[PDB]
Design a binder for this molecule. Structure first.
Ligand SMILES: *[C@@H]1O[C@H](CO)[C@@H](O[C@@H]2O[C@H](CO)[C@@H](O[C@@H]3O[C@H](CO)[C@@H](O)[C@H](O[C@@H]4O[C@H](CO)[C@@H](O)[C@H](O[C@H]5O[C@H](CO)[C@@H](O)[C@H](O)[C@@H]5O)[C@@H]4O)[C@@H]3O)[C@H](O)[C@H]2NC(C)=O)[C@H](O)[C@H]1NC(C)=O
Ligand SMILES: *[C@@H]1O[C@H](CO)[C@@H](O[C@@H]2O[C@H](CO)[C@@H](O[C@@H]3O[C@H](CO)[C@@H](O)[C@H](O)[C@@H]3O)[C@H](O)[C@H]2NC(C)=O)[C@H](O)[C@H]1NC(C)=O
Ligand SMILES: *[C@@H]1O[C@H](CO)[C@@H](O[C@@H]2O[C@H](CO)[C@@H](O)[C@H](O)[C@H]2NC(C)=O)[C@H](O)[C@H]1NC(C)=O
Ligand SMILES: *[C@@H]1O[C@H](CO)[C@@H](O[C@@H]2O[C@H](CO)[C@@H](O)[C@H](O)[C@H]2NC(C)=O)[C@H](O)[C@H]1NC(C)=O
Ligand code: NAG
Ligand code: NAG
Ligand code: NAG
Ligand code: NAG
Ligand code: NAG
Ligand code: NAG
Lengths: 755, 66, 64
């Protein structure tokens, strides 16, 4: 038959071209056409598609010759013209197509109405579909002798079907007449199709269905009449459908349904009443009661309330969708018999409360959807019988309280979604600060996998989340109200790839200690209002290279979009980019001298005192150096200091760095020099000389000496010798000047200066 | 087995245009088939999809949240 | 804003692709289609690159 060889061969003698593609072949005719008359897709033994672009029935002359397709299951013809007074089988013969099971003929370019002749020699078909959007007429003898058809689909804006269309359809099992214009059920047809199981009649205009319409339809298992503009149904419309298992009434116009609508349909397995196009306030008493085989319900119709007896004695129900109605509550007895219920969906209603006993008997419930409602609490009883519940969704309610015993009995629970509520877990601030071991209401659920608390008012990482939930995989704390972190807040013990989201909280400080059980927990800290002061030093060191304590490697923090909010100087810069000596905390004026600003730098434990009013004649009263501090920098640049105080002066006695460039100093006594001093910048002062006692003191201690009017005579010899042997301590040695003429001090010898 | 058939919400034409194959919606803004049981506001419509631009398939788009 | 029946992830491999998040599993809105149709997400391919994830309504001769 047709395969790789026939396709390659088709080029050389080719009015058509063929190219293999994946497991199929695409044939186009003519070969060089932008808009080929025919495009054939061949998947050997499986199907052949003929895509047509015809102007005339004579165009069939451009079909490929000698294709020999062979046996194939499905023939699909699209946009083709009905071949005049010639059977479609003749086109298929020409292509060498053998014994197809299925013929699909979908076209808006018919050229004529379909006829019985068109199906000559195709009486063996099991499946036939005819589809068109042309104004057209199907003659009721079309399906003469089609005694093998099991599946029939006709779509042609059909207004009516004379009963005799069904005369020979003894094997028919499925009818698809959806999307036509049917106003009435054809009479006396079901006796012709004693095996009929599926009756699809959706998107028609069947506004007058009555019981007699289904006389003889005892074989029927499925009836679908969705979107038929139906306003009312008589209570006995389905009386003859005694074996029906699936009914679809969706997308209609009901304002009520009569009581007893399904009383004669005791094999019902699934009913759908979805997207009713008007408000349907409620359902009649016991509508779905006393059904021994009913498993699935889909009900969405703006329902305002349900009667407590709606499902009574219907014990086999496993799936109920009641989402997207207007329910404010449910009667307590609604689910009293539903011992086998697995999934209940009540999402998108207006529920303000559920009776405590509502789920008393649904002990097999595995999935419960309550999201998008107005619930305010979870009581101690509501879920107390729900040992098998696996996922609970209560997103976007108004939840404010969770009873302490709410989750004691839900040992089966694995996925808990409480996102977008008003949950604060009612936690006192001092209990938190005092590091009290406090279990959340979720603490009973050691097996929990997902805890989603996104967008509530949590302020604290609870004990059970870290130490009891050893299997926790996902913990969403984003958009909550956590205001600070310690290393204890990140100590989650779960060994199941735990990911914690703490983005968009109120995290202003993260305080990790200096000091330097084998899991790995990821924590997302992005988008928090971090205050970048001296208090986050070790966190910053952790984020970069330097600091890697014992706890540090138990977790992995995501900080790539964690950005300083304060202070102004650092605002905007990502935590990784921060230089650790920039992290400062101010020292306020009481402490800090009047016209001075002072801060602490934790990176090297320095108290920094800046006084730059430019008008000081004396060193002002200094604050004492904390015993935990190592460095004290006294910045007095460009003032007019006349003298220094003695080294015994409180505060000033502990200074390690004197920055005095640009002052009025005329002499330096060694007893004016603080004892822990390691840097003395006395450049640009009024100094003429330095006593040998000061030079002895300077021997590490670093010095700047330029910009002074040095007196280079015989008394300057010790100073000259000092400078010559202290290349390391005197950065500006080369800029020292002797002012007796002015000559660089480095150009003077001890002989020049001192005869 | 024999007699099965997959239906799609949107009509499309697959074709070759090396040889590149594309899928284009059969019509523009056509309502989807089998779409008579969605909420009215969903307004189902067939939309052209692209791979980066090559038309790659035709899909039914619903106007609802995710 | 728009939603499709089968969730998919678009990727870059420089060619862009779309892969079913749930190939061979039910489409979303599975309960919204006429009776006898079994809605299953299918991965489609273009030329072998994953081009599109689409909801196929499977039908057959056998009832259920
Ligand atoms: C009535 O209500 C009950 C109770 O809720 C429902 O039962 C539950 O049905 C769930 C859906 O079928 C089912 O969940 C499955 O669990 C399996 C675990 O064994 C998973 O394999 C399965 O696959 C998932 O499918 C997703 C798309 O929906 C997709 O994200 C992902 O699929 C990937 O993996 C598969 C595996 O091969 C690949 O083929 C695929 O290509 C993707 O790569 C995901 O894994 C799904 O999670 C629950 O187990 C059922 N719970 C029970 C029985 O208690 C009934 O379905 C409801 N009935 C009706 C008619 O509505
Ligand atoms: C924790 O929850 C937060 C908030 O919902 C998640 O934040 C989101 O993270 C993604 C990336 O992981 C951000 O998307 C990316 O944005 C950047 C910005 O230029 C850009 O590369 C792309 O636009 C990309 O999509 C997203 O903006 C961000 N949203 C918010 C509101 O912050 C975070 O992913 C969660 N952490 C997890 C899941 O580990
Ligand atoms: C946090 O939850 C609140 C409350 O559910 C969300 O606020 C709602 O947002 C929607 C969408 O804009 C509005 O239609 C509602 O009116 C809001 N409700 C209230 C009570 O304000 C809020 O969007 C959520 N925030 C985040 C980041 O998810
Ligand atoms: C500190 O020393 C400076 C020297 O730089 C003094 O300023 C100078 O004073 C003389 C004498 O009055 C003026 O001629 C100069 O013009 C001043 N120079 C300036 C102001 O830059 C300053 O007066 C001294 N201050 C104290 C308090 O002793
Ligand atoms: C069919 O072919 C004609 C050329 O005669 C072209 O104008 C038209 O666009 C084609 N239609 C399709 C659907 O390919
Ligand atoms: C189909 O038949 C009807 C009535 O038998 C007729 O009115 C119509 O013209 C026909 N359509 C054609 C020939 O395209
Ligand atoms: C169909 O329903 C009738 C009741 O009218 C019953 O006698 C018959 O056994 C049913 N057939 C099947 C297969 O259940
Ligand atoms: C689940 O269903 C079985 C069978 O109907 C029933 O006996 C049982 O009590 C139900 N509940 C639990 C928790 O198994
Ligand atoms: C954070 O939570 C507090 C309650 O602790 C409350 O003021 C509010 O929900 C949140 N505050 C802000 C400023 O959003
Ligand atoms: C000098 O520094 C040492 C070590 O930091 C300290 O023990 C001592 O008390 C300091 N002296 C003064 C006067 O601050």
């Amino acid at each position: 038959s047709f395969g790789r060889d026939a396709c390659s061969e088709m080029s050389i003698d080719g009015l058509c071209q063929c190219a293999p593609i994946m497991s199929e072949y695409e044939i186009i005719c003519p070969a060089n056409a932008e808009n080929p008359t025919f495009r054939l897709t061949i998947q050997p033994k499986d199907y052949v598609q003929i895509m047509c672009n015809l102007t005339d029935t004579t165009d069939y002359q451009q079909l490929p010759k000698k294709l020999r397709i062979g046996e194939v299951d499905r023939v699909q013809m699209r946009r083709c013209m009905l071949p005049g007074h010639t059977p479609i089988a003749s086109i298929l013969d020409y292509l060498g197509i053998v014994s197809p099971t299925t013929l699909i003929f979908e076209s808006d370019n018919l050229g004529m109405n379909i006829t019985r002749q068109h199906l000559d020699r195709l009486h063996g078909l099991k499946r036939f579909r005819f589809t068109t959007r042309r104004l057209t007429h199907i003659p009721a003898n079309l399906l003469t002798d089609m005694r093998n058809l099991s599946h029939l689909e006709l779509r042609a804006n059909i207004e009516e079907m004379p009963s005799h269309l069904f005369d020979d359809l003894e094997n028919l099992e499925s009818i698809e007449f959806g999307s036509n214009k049917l106003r009435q059920m054809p009479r006396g047809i079901f006796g012709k199709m004693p095996k009929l199981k599926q009756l699809n009649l959706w998107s028609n205009q069947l506004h007058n269905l009555t019981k007699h319409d289904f006389e003889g339809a005892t074989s029927v298992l499925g009836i679908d009449i969705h979107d038929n503009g139906i306003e009312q149904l008589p209570h006995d419309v389905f009386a003859h459908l005694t074996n029906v298992t699936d009914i679809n009434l969706s997308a209609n116009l009901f304002r009520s349904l009569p009581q007893g609508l399904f009383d004669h349909n005791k094999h019902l397995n699934e009913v759908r009443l979805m997207n009713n196009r008007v408000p349907l306030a409620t359902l009649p008493s016991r509508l779905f009661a006393n059904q021994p085989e009913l498993q699935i319900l889909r009900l969405r119709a703006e329902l305002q309330s349900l009667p407590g007896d709606l499902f009574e004695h219907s014990t086999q129900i496993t799936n109920i969708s009641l989402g997207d109605n207007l329910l404010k509550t449910l009667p307590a007895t609604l689910l009293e018999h539903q011992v086998n219920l697995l999934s209940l969906d009540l999402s998108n209603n207006r529920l303000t409360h559920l009776p405590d006993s509502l789920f008393a008997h649904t002990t097999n419930l595995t999935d419960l959807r309550l999201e998008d409602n107005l619930l305010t609490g979870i009581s101690g009883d509501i879920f107390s019988n729900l040992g098998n519940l696996v996922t609970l969704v209560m997103s976007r309610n108004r939840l404010r309280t969770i009873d302490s015993r709410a989750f004691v009995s839900t040992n089966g629970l694995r996925h808990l979604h409480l996102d977008h509520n008003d949950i604060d877990l009612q936690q006192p601030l001092l209990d938190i600060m005092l590091q009290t071991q406090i279990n959340s209401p979720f603490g009973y659920m050691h097996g929990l996998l997902t805890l989603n608390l996104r967008n509530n008012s949590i302020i604290f990482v609870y004990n059970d989340w870290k130490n009891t939930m050893l299997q926790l995989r996902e913990l969403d704390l984003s958009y909550n109200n956590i205001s600070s972190l310690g290393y204890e807040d990140l100590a989650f013990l779960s060994q199941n790839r735990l990911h914690v989201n703490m983005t968009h909280n109120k995290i202003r400080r993260i305080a990790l200690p200096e000091d330097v059980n084998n899991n790995l927990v990821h924590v997302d800290l992005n988008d928090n209002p971090l205050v970048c002061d001296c208090t986050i030093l070790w966190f910053i060191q952790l984020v970069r290279g330097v600091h890697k304590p014992q706890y540090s490697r138990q977790f992995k923090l995501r900080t790539d979009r964690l950005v300083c909010s304060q202070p102004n100087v650092l605002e905007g810069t990502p935590v990784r980019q921060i230089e650790p000596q920039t992290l400062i905390c101010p020292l306020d004026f009481s402490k800090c001298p009047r016209g001075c600003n002072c801060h602490v730098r934790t990176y090297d434990k320095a108290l920094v005192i800046n006084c730059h009013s430019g008008n000081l004649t004396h060193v002002p009263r200094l604050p004492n150096l904390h015993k935990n501090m190592q460095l004290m920098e006294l910045h007095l640049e460009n003032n007019t200091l006349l003298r220094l105080p003695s080294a015994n002066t409180p505060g000033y006695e502990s200074v390690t760095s004197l920055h005095l460039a640009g002052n009025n100093l005329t002499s330096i006594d060694v007893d004016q020099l603080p004892t822990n001093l390691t840097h003395l910048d006395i450049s640009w002062n009024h100094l003429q000389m330095l006593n040998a006692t000061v030079l002895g003191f300077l021997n590490w201690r670093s010095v700047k000496l330029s910009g002074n009017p040095w007196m280079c005579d015989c008394t300057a010899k010790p100073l000259l010798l000092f400078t010559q042997d202290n290349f390391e301590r005197i950065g500006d040695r080369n800029e020292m000047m002797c002012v007796n003429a002015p000559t660089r001090m480095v150009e003077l010898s001890t002989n020049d200066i001192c005869p | 087995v024999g007699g099965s058939d997959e239906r799609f919400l949107c009509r499309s034409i697959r074709k070759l245009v090396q040889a590149i194959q594309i899928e284009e919606c059969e019509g523009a803004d056509q309502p989807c088939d089998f779409a008579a049981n969605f909420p009215q506001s969903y307004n189902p419509i067939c939309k052209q999809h692209y791979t980066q631009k090559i038309p790659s398939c035709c899909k039914c788009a619903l106007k609802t949240g995710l």
